[PDB]
Design a protein around this ligand. Sequence first.
Ligand SMILES: CC(=O)N[C@@H]1[C@@H](O)[C@H](O)[C@@H](CO)O[C@@H]1O
Length: 330
Amino acid sequence: SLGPLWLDVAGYELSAEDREILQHPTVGGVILFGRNYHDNQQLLALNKAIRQAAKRPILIGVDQEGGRVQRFREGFSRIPPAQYYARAENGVELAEQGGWLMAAELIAHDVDLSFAPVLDMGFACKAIGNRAFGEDVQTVLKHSSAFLRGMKAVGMATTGKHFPGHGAVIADSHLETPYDERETIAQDMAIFRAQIEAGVLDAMMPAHVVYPHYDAQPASGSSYWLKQVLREELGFKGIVFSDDLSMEGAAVMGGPVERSHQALVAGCDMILICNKREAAVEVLDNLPIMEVPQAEALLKKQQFSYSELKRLERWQQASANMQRLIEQFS
Ligand SMILES: CC(=O)N[C@@H]1[C@@H](O)[C@H](O)[C@@H](CO)O[C@@H]1O
């Protein structure tokens, strides 16, 4: 937790070079991907090794939303697309089972957090699609609040994304960054405002999206979006993540070093450099030695094994119900 930088590792086991870089104080987390996941035991061993190499507390995170975005599937309960809960007759009840189950099984495998939930509105943006909980404000709020309650219940920190709303985004040749040219995105942002005000988000990830009515920069590299709006207008007090600086970020600024500088000056607390070990190293060398003490809030609050978890009727039911829900609409 201590440092701002999130990076990844190459495979199923920690390398000797991994063990060295994990000790760099500017590192605060490892983001895991599908290529880091083979099986439950291998995952447990990998995370144990990460925490031992780091020595100090360190965050381990994953994109585990359900549906199209679930890095760990084999040997885990399948989680439905976030869209599916609101299609069921008891959606709010099931959304909480989905969030609880997703979070519980990650904690059982020594993972601190999932970069979830998606608070975007609508299904028309290809990148989002059925990752959204609904296509109007109330449906999104109702079902995302349930999912959040489930995460909270097991001690997992929560991350709203992709602020200030990725639901209506276009990524064609009209501009060089995905964009949303609407004169107002008030409804999209109202979802974020509501969850911020309810105090249910520990963290926030911004969208790599330009909203030209508002500001020239992608929100993820925008002083307006991340300070003026997110902090001053909206009163968000949690952790702000960057986007993946390796393929997103303020691309016009230059390389990883320039993108990292812009993310931090814009108001990100923590920065992500994925898929590019040599870029992570470059950024570590460029930056001051940095600390993010408030990121300790993101470390998981509970500890238990998968065996212990499965003894809960709550697990027995949630797991079965998620499989039913998937089968109901797939
Ligand atoms: C629009 C989109 O999918 N953005 C993703 C985000 O959800 C994810 O948490 C992050 C880390 O993998 O990479 C991206 O920025």
